[PDB]
Design a binder for this molecule. Structure first.
Ligand SMILES: Nc1ncnc2c1ncn2[C@@H]1O[C@H](COP(=O)(O)OP(=O)(O)O)[C@@H](O)[C@H]1O
Ligand SMILES: Nc1ncnc2c1ncn2[C@@H]1O[C@H](COP(=O)(O)OP(=O)(O)O)[C@@H](O)[C@H]1O
Ligand SMILES: Nc1ncnc2c1ncn2[C@@H]1O[C@H](COP(=O)(O)OP(=O)(O)O)[C@@H](O)[C@H]1O
Ligand SMILES: [Mg+2]
Ligand SMILES: [Mg+2]
Ligand SMILES: [Mg+2]
Lengths: 524, 524, 524
């Protein structure tokens, strides 16, 4: 298509309207006095959210040039989120701020390429400063405070996160999903358990639960489909002699084999149960191996050239108890010595280290938890669906910020950390005067989040900023209680990694943007 | 697509118009002096209805913002309905109320997030208050009153519901369907019966009904298709010796087997009949098991490795009489001891407890009824189809409210319960003044349903509310007889669970709503 | 789609223009001075008709609201017709009347829900009153009078209907179809006959008719296709010995068998004929059973495990004569004793009682006639096609009204019955004044049909109604002769069931309609 090209101040002015429409939709939500935005949906009911990256992905503008502005700053908000899943509004606010100020200096006749260099120097400096202010967050109380503050001041989320973090340990997963009732609820599953039900409801020796239960059972791990019962006989009978029940975790148990197993368990011959293997594809075999290790058994796959028939009792895993539902098997307390348990865990330790992907990382951490600590699920309660969505998202949001606190620390919120690092770099200079403005451009933007937080309360940003600026260390403004104080004492903690990412990402794009001199796009 | 974004008072005004159009099409229908709305349909004739969620789901507006408003309140009405099938208009009315008043206070310059906290606090309070006013509704008289009142003052609906509730008992289903004539009619099927006709009209030993009848018959339950008669012989002959007739409920009876059975029953050899199994898929086998239990027989499926041939008389169920039509089998009085009956019922008791779905819940409750109490059908009469639709809906509607009465109790209608819980909270306060206004915003809306009820009679809401406000307990206004009195004595009872759900849902959304500060949506 | 919602008097006004455009197109046709409407057709030539439900179905309006109007009153005319195939214009006229009046009182500020209650009470009362004026119509003369009056005063239709009703008896069908010439013609087939021709034109022993004729023939009823002649031999030869001819009614006679039969009959071996079974699917077997009964033969189907070979002469049905054309077999006078005939008829008597369908009802009544009375056909004559359509329709129309007279009786026409029940309810009252207007609203509409009859004559409705109102019993106005008199004596009889369905249906929807307060529909 034919293009519309626009140059210099003209192009920039459109660019900024672009940034501004997005920035302004995203700002309304900053801080405890944040407000919500409503994003429409051709789908079904609209969505009410407080979450900056949600609002930001929706903004698309009709003027092709305004649009390019908005589609650019939009990535600060987006990246901020893939990085720590929080602080996306802050980020946006900082970029709108670096760009506003920067462009105004380009209009003063400064060389943008230097404005940029100064802005990045300013920033690299601020990042060190942050790492210096950061203090570790490692007690349950602090963790609760980052949760809480992330969840727009929902003390309950704070607590629940803090609680879960506590039970599943350091290497345990926590996930959030819709709840049944109105109140939030925390499930913690003990030890190892996966997503597989009995293959026939006949195995069920306890109908009141609708679930199967065996004690001191041997476990047969077969990495292959099971059709012929012939393959079993030498084994099933070695077990009938030891007088103990048996779990069968194979790739699958089909008609011919299953039917007969079902007939055999029924008549009170040998107590048995069978259930599909966890997952599919490649991880199945590796994850079935997990199960081997935990119960001290040997995987029987046709890959190492093995036959079910040639398997003595010894190959079988063992545990003290197992529990299986319509769609959930669980092994309690495996015989595997913690020598071998700890070892296999020290292997899947480095699986994550060289997991060059994001999805190849999730699963490994899951397995680590099923073998080491525990798995926790939070359920968010809500009266409505418009409510579930927003509430769920905040818990999700805070879940992330705590994980961030834990690895990177905390600094004073209400954008005090940033305002503080700005005074620490009051003396930073670059290779030339433009660069010095460039630096000053960033220091000034570093006041933005506190300034919006305040404006969203309907008081005066420059009065609050002045008195915060007049103090020291962690003195800051409590927007919620409208009083000044020590931000760490008041429990207003930002996870250091988020304050940091918001600065980096926002500067990284704002930086580029202010060096636009030409813009090319389609004809209306 | 390029978006239109709107901010603050601007966006809200539009949002309100949107709420308002919907809320006012819903209002017209509130209470005994309600009027109906006509909803068009590209389909066939329009639809006349009084039912608030029906009107609501139709409203869609041309201003994309006004629409957003409307599509949002629309969920209070919707949720209300998935929750108790009733009170949807009240709900709507309350939300229109909480919003109007709430936005007015945002324009006052209150912090909407607090307005929300006050509103919720006000509501959590009001729910407790209602659970306190609730009294159990458990006689047949009260039940009739809830029915009656739900069916816009139709005493006959009240009575039929009350009557059915009484015969099918507490674990019995009641369903409504179109009737043949002009008058309503209540069918109650006694004990166990399902949707299956004879497999050949030849079995029919009584042509005058066009139906089959056997006394003291054995029952053969086969969980498998039946093609070969060979499989039958050992059994059919053990039955010919005992001189009793035989029912065959299998997965199916096809050509070869059936034909011969048909030939055998014909010649006066052995009195037999055959009929498909109930349902399909997985429930068939479980439900066929029901039939086993009720008649004290043993299911014969190839899954436990069983053969028809190896079945003595003993495996066969038995009853005192069976009745089968073109499409309805029914077993009268099974031999199964109530020891085993009561037990299998205590199992399907907890099937519903862990039925994590809505459709996996319907079927279980059905079976419970076929095994415990009874099944009842109501037929709604009407001269026309425009009439049938509206009348059927109301019966359905009241059917729901009585089920709600029964599980959660009744409170005073005419929106007296709500007006009373508002004076109980005259002292509620929150953390800060905005929250106090927030609280007051809700208490105020709690007057809405009575004030519409009154307006819809064309008298003066604030006069009626003032004198109701001036009494005590259950004094209220009888809009139908235009006189004051005790609302429970006058049989104007609301089911507690609906009054409460109306409040909850409407507050739940209106609450979020009043905290919109930005709105994003498409270009016209 | 975005909707256009309309509220109170506004939405009503549009609703009523709606009812009006329809009501008016329908009115023009009412009574003997009725006129015709022309309804266009993308198809072929337009359609000239007098028939209210025909005009009505066409009306659809451009104003989405006016349209709703129209599409709703449209249902009175529609139901009216499914219910007694007549009175549909009167119906229409009463609804336009109940609406007009009703709405005018909602404008007075009555409570429409009560307007409605009184309009129904009024009506329930009127229906009793009609059942009380109704006198049975059971001589051939009165029957002619209902036909005649139904057929816009076509004495010839009256007569023909009366004539048929007389010959086919009470359980005989009468159908109307296009005729060959210009004059109407009544065919009456005697006894049993169906739609099947010889399977080979060679069977024909009388070429002058082009048809087959056998006397004292045995009848072979085979419920199965016939391919092998082997299956026949034992039988064909038992018949060759008795020296009588043979009819073969099987599911079909194909190549191999047929060919040989054809060769055998040809050479003067044994006199035989063959013809397909009546209908297909399930009724075939049941209907072939009919033929069995009538001729005292035994159906030979492989379903009861039977073979053609094992059939002696005894199994064969018998009659005194049979007559078969290119597409019509007919059996004259079967040997079956009326003990068994009457019985099988007493079974298909209750087939109709429990025929829960409309199509499962037509066939049964057919069979009843082929076994009990006779079948009659009327042929309508016309010069043109524009003419055949309208005439045929009227005969059809009157065919219905007579069937209705016969089951429910007659009342005085020209709208006199309704005007008389109206003075009988002069004292009816309801629970409150609004209901009293509502009563009075209906009693007034009850004058509508006489008022239109008169206006269609171009005289003055309120002079005619005054004088008619001034008389008694069956005094009324003969619109055709423009003189007053006793309407029963002048043969102006309306079948009671129609006068009552007109009232029922019109009030049933008019009733709802006047309780519209909102109307929702699409944007233009
Ligand atoms: N009581 C409070 N006073 C001042 N700031 C607060 C208070 N509570 C939370 N905050 C601050 O709110 C800021 C961000 O909240 P949020 O609106 O989610 O922005 P983001 O999406 O950028 O995380 C953090 O700086 C946190 O310090
Ligand atoms: N005689 C009456 N006087 C005052 N209120 C009544 C009377 N009869 C019924 N109501 C009130 O009607 C209200 C609801 O009727 P309805 O129009 O179905 O609204 P909803 O759809 O909100 O259930 C209930 O609060 C009930 O108390
Ligand atoms: N000579 C007559 N005088 C008055 N009314 C008549 C006369 N002939 C027929 N009618 C009346 O005509 C009315 C209906 O005829 P018709 O136009 O078909 O209306 P509908 O479709 O409503 O049957 C009946 O009420 C019948 O009594
Ligand atoms: Mg945040
Ligand atoms: Mg209701
Ligand atoms: Mg007529």
């Amino acid at each position: 298509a034919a293009k519309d090209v626009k140059f210099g101040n003209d192009a920039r002015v459109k660019m900024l309207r672009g940034v501004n429409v997005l920035a302004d939709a995203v700002k309304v939500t900053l801080g405890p006095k944040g407000r919500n935005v409503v994003l429409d949906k051709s789908f079904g009911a609209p969505t009410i959210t407080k979450d900056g990256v949600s609002v930001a992905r929706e903004i698309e503008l009709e003027d092709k040039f305004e649009n390019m502005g908005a589609q650019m700053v939009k990535e600060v908000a987006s990246k901020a989120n893939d990085a720590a899943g929080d602080g996306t509004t802050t980020a946006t606010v900082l970029a709108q701020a670096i760009i506003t100020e920067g462009l105004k200096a380009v209009a003063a006749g400064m060389n943008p390429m230097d404005l940029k260099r100064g802005i990045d120097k300013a920033v690299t400096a601020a990042v060190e400063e942050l790492k210096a202010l950061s203090v570790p967050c490692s007690d349950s109380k602090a963790i609760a405070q980052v949760g809480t503050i992330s969840a727009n001041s929902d003390e309950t989320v704070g607590k629940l996160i803090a609680e879960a973090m506590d039970k599943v340990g350091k290497e345990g997963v926590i996930t959030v999903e819709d709840g049944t009732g109105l109140q939030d609820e925390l499930d913690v599953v003990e030890g190892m358990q996966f997503d597989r039900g009995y293959l026939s409801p006949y195995f069920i020796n306890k109908p009141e639960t609708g679930a199967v239960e065996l004690e001191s059972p041997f476990i047969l791990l077969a990495d292959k489909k099971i059709s012929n019962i012939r393959e079993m006989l030498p084994v099933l009978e070695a077990v009938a002699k030891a007088g103990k029940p048996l779990l069968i975790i194979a790739e699958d148990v089909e008609g011919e084999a299953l039917a007969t197993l079902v007939v055999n368990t029924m008549r009170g011959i040998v107590k048995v149960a069978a259930v599909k293997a966890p997952g599919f594809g490649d991880r199945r075999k590796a994850m079935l191996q997990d199960i081997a290790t935990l119960t001290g058994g040997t995987v029987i796959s046709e890959e190492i050239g093995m036959e079910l028939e040639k398997a003595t009792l010894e190959d079988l895993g063992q545990a003290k108890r197992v529990v299986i539902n319509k769609d959930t098997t669980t092994i309690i307390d495996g015989v595997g010595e913690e020598a071998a348990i700890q070892g296999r865990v020290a292997q899947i330790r480095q699986q994550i280290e060289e997991a060059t992907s994001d999805y190849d990382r999730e699963k490994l951490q899951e397995r680590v938890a099923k073998l080491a600590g525990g798995v926790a699920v939070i359920k968010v309660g809500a009266a409505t669906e418009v409510e579930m969505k927003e509430k769920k998202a905040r818990v999700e949001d805070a879940l992330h910020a705590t994980r961030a606190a834990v690895e990177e620390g905390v600094v004073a919120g209400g954008g005090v950390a940033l305002i503080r690092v700005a005074s620490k770099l009051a003396d930073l200079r670059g290779q030339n005067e433009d660069q010095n403005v460039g630096i000053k451009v960033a220091l000034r933007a570093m006041e933005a989040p506190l300034r919006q937080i305040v404006l969203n309360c309907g008081e005066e940003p420059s009065v609050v900023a002045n008195t915060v600026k007049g103090g020291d260390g962690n003195y800051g403004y409590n927007a919620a209680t409208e009083e000044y104080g020590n931000m760490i004492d008041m429990g207003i903690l930002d996870p250091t990694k988020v304050t940091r990412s918001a600065l980096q990402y926002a500067a990284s794009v704002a930086g580029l943007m202010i060096t636009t001199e030409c813009m090319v796009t389609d004809l209306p």
